[PDB]
Design a binder for this molecule. Structure first.
Ligand SMILES: CC(C)CCC[C@@H](C)[C@H]1CC[C@H]2[C@@H]3CC=C4C[C@@H](O)CC[C@]4(C)[C@H]3CC[C@]12C
Ligand SMILES: CC(C)CCC[C@@H](C)[C@H]1CC[C@H]2[C@@H]3CC=C4C[C@@H](O)CC[C@]4(C)[C@H]3CC[C@]12C
Ligand SMILES: CC(C)CCC[C@@H](C)[C@H]1CC[C@H]2[C@@H]3CC=C4C[C@@H](O)CC[C@]4(C)[C@H]3CC[C@]12C
Ligand SMILES: CCn1c(=O)c2c(nc(/C=C/c3ccc(OC)c(O)c3)n2C)n(CC)c1=O
Ligand SMILES: CCCCCCCC/C=C\CCCCCCCC(=O)O
Ligand SMILES: CCCCCCCC/C=C\CCCCCCCC(=O)O
Ligand SMILES: CCCCCCCC/C=C\CCCCCCCC(=O)O
Ligand SMILES: CCCCCCCC/C=C\CCCCCCCC(=O)O
Ligand SMILES: CCCCCCCC/C=C\CCCCCCCC(=O)O
Ligand SMILES: CCCCCCCC/C=C\CCCCCCCC(=O)O
Ligand SMILES: CCCCCCCC/C=C\CCCCCCCC(=O)O
Ligand SMILES: CCCCCCCC/C=C\CCCCCCCC(=O)O
Ligand SMILES: CCCCCCCC/C=C\CCCCCCCC(=O)O
Ligand SMILES: CCCCCCCC/C=C\CCCCCCCC(=O)O
Ligand SMILES: CCCCCCCC/C=C\CCCCCCCC(=O)O
Ligand SMILES: CCCCCCCC/C=C\CCCCCCCC(=O)O
Ligand SMILES: CCCCCCCC/C=C\CCCCCCCC(=O)O
Ligand SMILES: CCCCCCCC/C=C\CCCCCCCC(=O)O
Ligand SMILES: CCCCCCCC/C=C\CCCCCCCC(=O)O
Ligand SMILES: CCCCCCCC/C=C\CCCCCCCC(=O)O
Ligand SMILES: CCCCCCCC/C=C\CCCCCCCC(=O)O
Ligand code: NA
Length: 388
């Protein structure tokens, strides 16, 4: 079968992906520039990772189409064509790592967050991450390559000029780089870290909710104790547990300013031994509870759920990165570790490459389904500018 008919399917699919990559991720960048509600440190990393996906469509995918022809070229120019995509992939791992650490700080030290994270420091972290991304991804050009042992049978067959090679990924890029250095050290290790960070985020959130609900059950069982109590020694106890629980839940001020004051007064009645005026005084507490602290515990509960919903959106993007990228890394593993195995067939190579490229399309859809601010901003731009 002429190679050119299978080539035409591959190339057509690649071009289709490129257009979706650029369109959807240019829309993300327009939303964030326009809507100031979307201008948070969290979203500057999302614009960084949108940039990487845009350049997959404009550069990486065109590079992949041409490397697959075997065209004659100077070996070091082949390596750049072949490795630029490793730069863009590394950049996305750092952006993904950053968003996880950012969402963890948000949930773990909400007090200090705005102090510790700032948009000026953010831009710094992003620049450094791109420089690093070029460094990791183009390490083969500093000498860790196969340019020094060219396949001159294949150069002469293709009729390349002198000094030229048949430009093929697995010919110029060594497989020990790809498996030990790129996959194990630079992709897989960072991904396991994200797994761990996200584990603590959901753990700290599950345990923050529990602490709220405990303070709520501590506050009302103690209340049942004062109600049908007997001695002033046990009214005291049932009110000491309420004050500690009040101060714990504090970490709006009016509702608590009164509640702790009301405990204080009812306590001194108990201490001078007036039992039943201290009792009766602790039912006016019920009033402050329903009027203030329960609006407090309800809206604190609502906010933790917002933060967890946002952290779950970020985890889905990281998970989809791994899904789309592991097949190629696993095939390379087979290629490198089993020289007794037959090399994966060409049609499977191209499915795995195509699949790693698909990751550049999916993120815009996740924002639109899962984050209402993005979805409404998307709606406003399409209707306002494209369609009307
Ligand atoms: C502003 C953007 C578009 C700049 C992109 C520049 C790109 C397209 C340039 C910069 C380096 C170039 C390569 C440098 C060297 C050679 C070796 C030669 O034997 C074949 C072409 C090849 C492999 C070039 C192809 C095109 C190339 C990759
Ligand atoms: C977190 C998870 C995804 C880590 C990645 C698991 C990888 C490293 C594992 C899972 C399957 C494994 C492969 C399974 C089978 C063989 C055949 C053998 O002749 C050579 C090793 C080789 C090719 C293994 C290499 C390592 C491998 C690719
Ligand atoms: C990341 C998750 C979804 C893993 C997906 C499974 C993929 C990566 C696995 C499952 C079956 C695997 C194949 C099993 C057997 C062979 C035959 C061997 O001669 C070359 C490799 C090849 C062709 C493997 C390539 C990788 C492969 C296609
Ligand atoms: C993510 C990094 N990366 C790769 O690792 C990668 C790759 N292409 C291949 C293999 C191509 C190939 C193999 C054997 C062939 O004939 C026997 C053949 O004709 C082509 N590999 C291994 N690319 C696409 C540009 C890439 O981006
Ligand atoms: C994603 C869904 C699109 C289907 C992907 C396949 C694109 C290229 C697959 C390779 C087909 C021709 C390669 C060959 O026959 O040698
Ligand atoms: C844009 C995606 C469609 C690609 C159409 C051009 C195909 C050219 C070709 O296959 O030779
Ligand atoms: C060549 C590089 C082209 C790739 C596109 C790079 C990204 C530019 C995005 C600028 C607009 C979004 C950031 C502005 C902001 O939200 O503060
Ligand atoms: C090669 C160079 C590619 C350009 C790299 C990133 C472009 C900017 C991406 C994110 C910019 C966010 C900064 C900000 O909005 O404040
Ligand atoms: C937004 C995507 C824009 C895509 C435009 C460019 C796509 C075409 C890609 C490269 C053309 C192929 C280069 C092949 C060199 C000659 C092959 C040969 O002589 O064997
Ligand atoms: C929009 C895409 C345009 C930007 C550049 C795209 C890829 C160009 C790749 C150039 C490879 C041609 C080499 C052919 C040769 O050496 O004879
Ligand atoms: C951005 C500027 C656009 C660059 C134009 C398209 C690159 C096409 C060059 C590849 C064709 C090689 C010519 C040849 O080998 O005969
Ligand atoms: C429009 C861009 C795509 C047009 C056709 C480019 C085909 C390049 C394949 C080289 C073999
Ligand atoms: C963009 C980078 C410019 C330099 C590209 C290096 C490859 C040149 C190949 C060579 O001259 O042998
Ligand atoms: C080749 C040397 C290193 C190349 C640097 C790569 C591009 C750096 C650009 C800055 C990223 C965007 C900064 C805005 C914050
Ligand atoms: C892989 C090779 C790594 C290349 C970079 C070597 C060391 C870079 C140092 C890191 C800079 C971090 C602090 C800089 C902020 C001032
Ligand atoms: C995970 C980070 C460690 C990565 C791989 C560990 C082993 C690296 C080299 C293995 C021995 C080299 C060889 O046998 O050729
Ligand atoms: C390599 C390990 C594979 C996992 C890769 C990264 C995980 C990133 C976040 C996954 C945790 C939550 C996933 C989800 O909720 O869908
Ligand atoms: C191993 C990686 C796990 C990736 C799956 C995460 C959720 C997929 C889409 C829901
Ligand atoms: C998490 C997964 C950690 C890595 C797991 C396996 C490492 C590679 C296995 C090496 C297979 C060697 C077989 C051989 O060379 O004979
Ligand atoms: C369908 C895409 C992948 C399905 C899962 C594994 C199928 C792999 C079979 C491809 C060739 C097997 C190896 C061989 O033929 O020598
Ligand atoms: C083929 C290209 C399709 C890309 C698949 C992911 C797109 C969004 C799913 C709805
Ligand atoms: Na990406």
């Amino acid at each position: 079968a002429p190679p050119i008919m299978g080539s035409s399917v591959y190339i057509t699919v690649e071009l289709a992906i490129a257009v979706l990559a650029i369109l959807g991720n240019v829309l993300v960048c327009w939303a964030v520039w326009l809507n100031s509600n979307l201008q948070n440190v969290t979203n500057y990393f999302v614009v960084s990772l949108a940039a990487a996906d845009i350049l997959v469509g404009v550069l990486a995918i065109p590079f992949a189409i041409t490397i697959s022809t075997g065209f004659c070229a100077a070996c070091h120019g082949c390596l750049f064509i072949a490795c630029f995509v490793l730069v863009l992939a590394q950049s996305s791992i750092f952006s993904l790592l950053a968003i996880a650490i950012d969402r963890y700080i948000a949930i773990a030290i909400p007090l200090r967050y705005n102090g510790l994270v700032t948009g000026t420091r953010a831009a710094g972290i992003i620049a450094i991450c791109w420089v690093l991304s070029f460094a990791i991804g183009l390490t083969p050009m500093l000498g860790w390559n196969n340019c020094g042992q060219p396949k001159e049978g294949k150069a002469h067959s293709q009729g390349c000029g002198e000094g030229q090679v048949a430009c093929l990924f697995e010919d110029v890029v060594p497989m020990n780089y790809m498996v030990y250095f790129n996959f194990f050290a630079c992709v897989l290790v960072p991904l396991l870290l994200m797994l761990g960070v996200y584990l603590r985020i959901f753990a700290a959130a599950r345990r923050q909710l529990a602490d709220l609900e405990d303070n709520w059950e501590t506050l009302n069982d103690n209340l049942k104790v004062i109600e049908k109590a007997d001695n002033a020694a046990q009214v005291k106890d049932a009110l000491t547990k309420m004050r500690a629980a009040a101060l714990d839940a504090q970490k709006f001020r009016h509702g608590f300013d009164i509640l702790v004051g009301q405990i204080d007064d009812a306590l001194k009645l108990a201490n001078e031994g007036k039992v039943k005026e201290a009792q009766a005084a602790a039912e006016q507490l019920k009033t402050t509870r329903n009027a203030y602290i329960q609006k407090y515990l309800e809206r604190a509960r609502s906010t933790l759920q917002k933060e967890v919903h946002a952290a779950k959106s970020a985890a889905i993007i990281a998970g989809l990165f791994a899904l789309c990228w592991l097949p190629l890394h696993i095939i390379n593993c087979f290629t490198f570790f089993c020289p007794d195995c037959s090399h994966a067939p060409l049609w499977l190579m191209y499915l795995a490459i195509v699949l790693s490229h698909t990751n550049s399309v999916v993120n815009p859809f996740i924002y639109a389904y899962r984050i209402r601010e993005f979805r409404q901003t998307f709606r406003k731009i399409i209707r306002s500018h494209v369609l009307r």
